[PDB]
Every structure is written in C-alpha cells, then in structure tokens.
Amino acid sequence: PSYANAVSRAAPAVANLYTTKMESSLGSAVIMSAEGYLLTNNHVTAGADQIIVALRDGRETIAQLVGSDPETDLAVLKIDLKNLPAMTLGRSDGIRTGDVCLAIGNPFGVGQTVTMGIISATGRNQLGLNTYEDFIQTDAAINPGNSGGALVDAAGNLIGINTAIFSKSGGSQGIGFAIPTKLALEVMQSIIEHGQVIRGWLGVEVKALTPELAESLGLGETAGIVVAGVYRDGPAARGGLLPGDVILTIDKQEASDGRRSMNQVARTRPGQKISIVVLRNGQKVNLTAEVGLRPPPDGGE
Amino acid sequence: PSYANAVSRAAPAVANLYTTKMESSLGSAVIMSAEGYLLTNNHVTAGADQIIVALRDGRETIAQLVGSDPETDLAVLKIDLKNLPAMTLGRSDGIRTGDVCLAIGNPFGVGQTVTMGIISATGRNQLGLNTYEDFIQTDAAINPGNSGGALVDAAGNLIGINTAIFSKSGGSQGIGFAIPTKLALEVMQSIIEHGQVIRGWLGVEVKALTPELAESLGLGETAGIVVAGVYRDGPAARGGLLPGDVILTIDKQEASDGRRSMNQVARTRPGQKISIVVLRNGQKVNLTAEVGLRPPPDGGE
Amino acid sequence: PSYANAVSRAAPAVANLYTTKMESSLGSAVIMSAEGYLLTNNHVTAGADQIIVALRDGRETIAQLVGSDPETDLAVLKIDLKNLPAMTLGRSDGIRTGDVCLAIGNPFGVGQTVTMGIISATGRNQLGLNTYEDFIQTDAAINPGNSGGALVDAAGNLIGINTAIFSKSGGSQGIGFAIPTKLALEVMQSIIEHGQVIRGWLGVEVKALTPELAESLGLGETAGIVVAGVYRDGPAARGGLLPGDVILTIDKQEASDGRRSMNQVARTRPGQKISIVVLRNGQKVNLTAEVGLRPPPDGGE
C-alpha cells in the first residue's frame, strides 16, 4: 500500500545534524519534545565544537549539548525554537519480528531519506558495539549519515534510534541496528536531569557455566551465573565472592542470564548495598554487598 | 500482499538493451508507445554503433536512435515491431515519500529483474549527476544494468526512469535515483519531434544570498537571486546585469530559488528577449534581455 | 502491514548450522519433518567433520549427514530430538514475480535474521553456479551466513532454500537466489532414500541453432536441439548421433529447450535405453539409445 501517512507524521520531527570539531560530520537527530530536546548518537556529537540542527521545514540553529552517555551511544541536545514538531512514541516492547518499519535519516548527506524494511530481530546484545545493548535489527537500508535518526513503525511512532550497521562494504547490506525507544527514554531522562547517566559499580566479572565443572553439583543450567575475575578498586572482592563462585540470585533475582545482572547492578544507585547468593562447594551461601559508582569510559561492524 | 499484478502490467513494456560501440554494454529501456518509441538513459546508448532491444516475450531487433539529451541523461529509440506492449504512465506529481514503488531492469545482466522499495524522497537536485535534475529517490535495489528501466508505482504505472545510484561498493546500498515521468515526457516529445531538446541561453551565473552583504537592504531572504559571474559570448552582460546584482523576479516571477531560474530560461525559446528586475544599491531596477541558444556539452555516485 | 505471523509460523523450523572441518563455518538449515530431517546447502556441510544444529528454542545437537547432492548444492541432515517444529511447504509453481517473500537465516553469524523482499524473477538457469538450476531470485537481503535457510512466502510457507547471491561487495546488493521447493523436495527424497541422487548419463553436448547453418532446412526455430561434441565413455556416440546432428524430439518430446533435455536425461534411470529423432540433411531420422549413470563431480557471484 503506502507508508506516506507514517512519513508525514514522523519526518517533521527528524533533523539533520552537522557538526564541526577540532573536522566536519553529518548525522541525524530526533525531536523528542516541543521544548527543543533532541536525541542522537554519542558518536555523532562527541567532541563537536559546534552542532547545527536543520529541520525539515528549513530552519537551522545551533544546538546545545545537554549531555551524553557513551555506554549506550546516546546524546541529548536542546535547541531554542518555537513551534517545534515532536515525535510520537511507539512501544519497543510490542514490536515483533516481521513488523514493517521505516528508517529516517541523512545517508551520505544526500538529504532526509526514508527507507523501508522489517524488524529483522529484537533484543540483539553480545554484538560488541556498546556496553549496554538491546538492539532492534532492521533490514531498512541504513547507511553512514543515518546515525541518530528515527526507526519508526508503520504508523509513524518512534521505536528506535538508528545507530549502527554490519557491512562488508561500508554501506548498507540489510543488517542495521537501532536502540529501542524504551531504553532510549530511560537514558534520555537522566541526561536531561543529571547531565549524565548514573550507574552502579560491582567488581564481579562473569561467564556461562560451560558445565564440565558445573556439571558438578548438577542442575538444569538453572539460575547459575559463573564468576571469573575481580577488579582493582571499590571492589566486590571485599563482600565475599571469589573466582569460581557461582551466583544463583542477585538481589533475590535469578542469575539465569549474565546480561540481566549487568542491568540490575547499573540501575542500583551508588552508595547502597545488596545481597547475592552464590553456590559454593554444593550449598547456598548468602552474601550481601555495597554499590560503587561506574567510572567513565554511523558505526560499522 | 503482492505486487504481481503491477509486475504483469508493466514488465512487458520494459526491454533489455545490449549495445556495441568502438565495446559491449547492458542497460534497460521503456516502451512508451505501440509505435515503437523507447526511453532510456543517454549514458547507455551514447556512442553505441549498434543497439539491440530484447523484449520480455523473446523477440529481438536492432533499434534506431531517434536522438538524445545528455543534460538530463535521456535518449529515445525507435524499433520496427508490431503488437508492442506499451507502458502506462503514472503522475510524478502525485507521488509521496513512503509510497511503494517497483524497479524493473537488467541488473548485472542477470535478466529482467523486479525490485521493491519505497519513494525515499522526491525532487532531488543539487546531486551533481546532470545539469537538470528533479530526481525521485528510491530504496528499491538498483544496480549497474538498471539504467533506462522503469520505476513503477504499486499499480504498475511509470513514475520514473532509473538512472543512477549512490554507493560505496559499486552496487546497491539503498540510495537510487529515477528521473520523474513528467520531466521525461517533456524531453521525450521534443527529441521525437526535433531530434534534440532546444533550450535557451543566458549569461548569468547565480548563488544564494549568504546574507552578510544581503543583510544590507535586509529582507526575509525573499525573492533574491544573487548574481556572480558572466560568460564569454551571446552574453546577458549586454542586457544590463553585473556581478553582485540581485534579481527579485525573472519574467515577472520570483527568484526565490536559483533552480527555477535555470528552468524558465531553458524553456524560453532561442531568439526571444525577456525582462528581469534585480535590486541594485537599494532600489528595484528593471532590465530586459534577449534569449540565446544553449550550446552542446548506470552512473554511480 | 506486518509479516510477524509468517515469521512466527516459519522461524521455529529454521536452524543455525555450525560446522567444523579439517576450520569453522556458519550456515542455516530448514527442519523439514518432525522426525528430524533437515535441508541445507552442500557448500555449507561439505567436508565438515562435525555439524551442530542450534534451534530457535535454544537446544543444540550434533547432526548426522544423510547424504548430499552437489549438482544442485543441496544436503540433508538428521537430528535426534523430540517435539521438533516442522516447516510448512508452499508451492514453488504458484509463485509470481512481485509476490512478497521472507528470507530466514544467520547472516554474518549475527543470529537468526528475517529479511523481506519480493520475488524478483523465477526460473533462473544459465547462471553458472550449479549444474541444475531453477533459481528463484529475490531482493530480500541475503548475505554470507544465509545459506541453507528458508525463503518463505507471505503466509510462512517454504518456497525455497537460500543458496547464493550476486554481488560486487561480498554482501547483499539485492540480487539473491533460492532453490525452489519443488526441486528441493525431489532431491531431498532420493537422498533420504538412496543416500544420493541417481541421474542418467548421455554423451551428447548441445547448443542453440544460431541459425545460419540451420536457416538451411529452415523452420521457425521450432523443436531443434543442435548437437556439438560427444564424450569419452559410456557414450551416446554408439547410438547414432554425430556432431552437427539436430534433435527435434527426445523420448517423443520437443527439443525446444536444451535445459529440458538435461532434465529428462537425468530423470531417466541408469541402465535403460531411449529414442531421439534428430534432423539429418533434411529428413527426420530416428535413433534409440541406452542410459548411462552420471559420474560424481553462501556462494557469491
């Protein structure tokens, strides 16, 4: 049929980013509210000395950088303009593979461009682009210049911020990646509020069972987070875990997935303490621990 | 759903071009009428010593070159065959970004190929491929061998002639460009009639305000075509404009856009004269001028 | 609209192939029946010393290789697992160019991936990838890692096994190729039964009229298979055909197309004999001949 109505709704709220540093770079950004806050990638505006925002209706203006979060590759901007169009929000949770989506951006500086595809996959982590990833995968053509633009559903509602691609040729081969809205709103709100995103710290480093040793004290591969390693300071080595310890629950929640344990720990405010039960030599042992702060640290492959 | 009905309507009127020069090249062409006239790109048939047309139903024949227009990258051909299928025409004006479209061509000589996408953008000029550009942008996969084939809407009606692509890899990365039908019919009809396209000549060369000097005698950036440069002969330097002059109206029409002024001047028949009012030192001055002829002069990036 | 329902139906029956040889390789495979038989490409599992099958629901298991057929680039596998989901079958015959289709695979090892396109063309032979080709062409993004996965119609029914691509860049440029289901079932059933595919042998090698000599004894290019060449042993040179002979019918069937004559001969069981009438010097001559066995012998361009 036609996706023009979706385009008409959403394209006004997607902007072209021109940045100058010390040299010149292109990207995209999404207008989140009529008050002038804009969402984009960190690798678009990082180190810029000047950010110009060019809107679909032709106005241009310099943008102020509210703040940035490199661990998710997001950044926030504020512009002083009246009568701004604002993107409507979709539900990242409600999307399904095979749903149709639209990417809106400035690929190769050609101008605002709409590309069409489907959701290829949801929840892509383990990719190796950012510390925290819940990537939406799409086959809508996404190219250098699409960063920070909008991935939008068939009705025009924002489902993601286009950030990266996997490609052998430096341009689209049908495998592109967008940060889900629900994740991007979380990051956007703290930045707007605290100029950054505050995460919690915990020494432990973990891996899967690979259950030859874990076959010992055998279970169905249920609720076991294997521990390997510790770190230099503000450590969780002084709360009771050791290399080889295995964690059934963190803050009374299953350690089935090591990705989830990253998330809970980041969302626990710095300066607090917490309880983890790991299985040592065949019996549940109970620990409790503090919470440190996390220290400070489009894209191809 | 399915675009097969669209394919069934349109594909019979799209032909495979094989050309030999002095060596061998592939392209596509569109059958515009049952009398055997065919539309294609200039860079497909330019310098060919022999053009073969192969139709979907298997017939082949040598084509005669009616004429060509390199400034838009169009060419016209005539074949002697009976019972030719003819492409139906869509309205280039009525297309909207997000509308679905189909590209029909011979990419890499693989054979007639249908690809599907959306209109990514309309009215693309400033690209740097041709002197006169009103490009439709699509993300339907377009590759070398697609030149001169049909961009068609969801019902099968011709909206454009696929001509070029932007790509880092020598093949499709989702950014392809088609010449709108309405423009291609204009060029097609004079070629068929006068063996070429006759345009009008005028010395002036222009640019935008960049209103630091124009901020002087300030206006809203309204109806001002900045002049910079003049040319060697049949000049419009002998009608009254000078470097630095600024033009509010050409032939009683606004100079808001320098692209439009190119178009009016090309469409004014050679041997006539015309009136332009530019703003000199703060007051409207009125000039009038003659019209010279324009002298004589798929694609990647 | 949305293809999610199609994805939900089909994706459970598409598996990720990891193979180790002597080193490591990725591909895809399709679960054809609840008894654990799987279809994939030959170039994915050929020479593997170990094949792991990873299902959408997370189970993994080593696969046994039933057998393989390199002349079509198909291979078959058997896994020992209960409650397997099974792909539903579409009709390769009923597909039309422009129909929507979905490709399901593991491109670049990113994980199970759904891409969307249309049927670009059907019946692609002469490509030069395999001896026997009836390729479905699609513009659904297909990349290295998609081999042996499912090309599926808009309702979720298998129409093809994704096997190859044409590309200048080592990744998708919109021209991908799937083996039709109807062909793949034929190959699958003999492999499952006889561990291989048994074809018949016949010396002759043929080409088109190119009717300068054939213009002699002129006909409409109807039912004429030109002969050129013969072979080393178990030949059909001892049944009566010679270089230059022209064949009107094979086994009382028209030689209009040399591709069809390949097919009839392969499908004639070894050890039998057959009748071919070729036109020699202007009169139909009738031969009859035996049938030899055929001897033994994702992908880019």
Author numbering:
A (entry chain A), B (entry chain A), C (entry chain A): 53 to 74, 103 to 377, 386 to 389
From the manuscript:
AlgW, a membrane-bound periplasmic serine protease belonging to the HtrA protein family, is a key regulator of the regulated intramembrane proteolysis (RIP) pathway and is responsible for transmitting the envelope stress signals in Pseudomonas aeruginosa. The AlgW PDZ domain senses and binds the C-terminal of mis-localized outer membrane proteins (OMPs) or periplasmic protein MucE, leading to catalytic activation of the protease domain. HtrA protease is characterized by its trypsin-like catalytic domain and regulatory PDZ domain; the catalytic triad was surrounded by several loops (L1, L2, L3, LD, LA) but, usually, in an inactive mode, and could be activated by sensing a specific molecular stimulus. The catalytic triad (H123, D153, and S227) sites are located between two β-barrels and are surrounded by activation loops L1 to L3, LD, and LA (named according to DegS nomenclature).
